[PDB]
Amino acid sequence: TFVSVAPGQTARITCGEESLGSRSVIWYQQRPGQAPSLIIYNNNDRPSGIPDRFSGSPGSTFGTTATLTITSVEAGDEADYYCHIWDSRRPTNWVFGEGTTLIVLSQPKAAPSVTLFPPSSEELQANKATLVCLISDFYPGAVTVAWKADSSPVKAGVETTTPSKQSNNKYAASSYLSLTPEQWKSHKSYSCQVTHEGSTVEKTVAPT
């Protein structure tokens, strides 16, 4: 589940089943690729290091749900949010509340950095070929990559990771292509064509 908020506005996030008794709900902000950081306990009591921006619902209300109020949303707050529910009426939950991804909107645009790498020489004597296109710092992660044999598309061997955000608006995607030793020398020059959001950028390489 995803929440998209304009910059500088206030976000809200919904966690868990409806309340049954007076509760004590914990709020966690897990950033992509990192560990969960404790944000709020006692339903509104935030520890050291957390600004008074983040809020919640006091666990004194029955029938309503657990709400997280992010005031003045900033870019860093892009993360997954979990919550641990302690209802006086329901047994101790060991399955954390299901996630809710915050998405600040209009970062707005990042042009990818495509870094094409030929196979390494030690790999060449080892009888294996591999092409390493490396796409960094792009937004958003909607990149689709094709490969060209001097003028012609390549069908098989194509390997490509997923656009992966990393503690920053920047994304990341690799692109490997397994090739036979005889064909890196046979063809003229190989092409990595990375397509992002509507802009295609292509990097080629030629053998020595």
Binding site: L20, D87, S88, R89, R90, P91
Partner: protein
């Protein structure tokens, strides 16, 4: 006080068909085994506006 007591209940509603068998469970909670559960939640068959 007794006379007034019965006189106040003479025109009110009699529960003579409320002796139907009941099917009960303990109440909705994280039971603390010590407390037996002071209330019970029960389904039963009741007659409607039609016999």
């Amino acid at each position: 006080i007794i006379s007034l007591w019965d006189q106040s209940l003479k025109p009110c509603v009699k529960l003579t068909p409320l002796c139907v068998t009941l099917q009960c469970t303990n109440v909705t909670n994280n039971i603390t085994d010590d407390m037996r559960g002071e209330m019970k939640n029960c389904s039963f068959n009741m007659t409607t506006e039609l016999r």
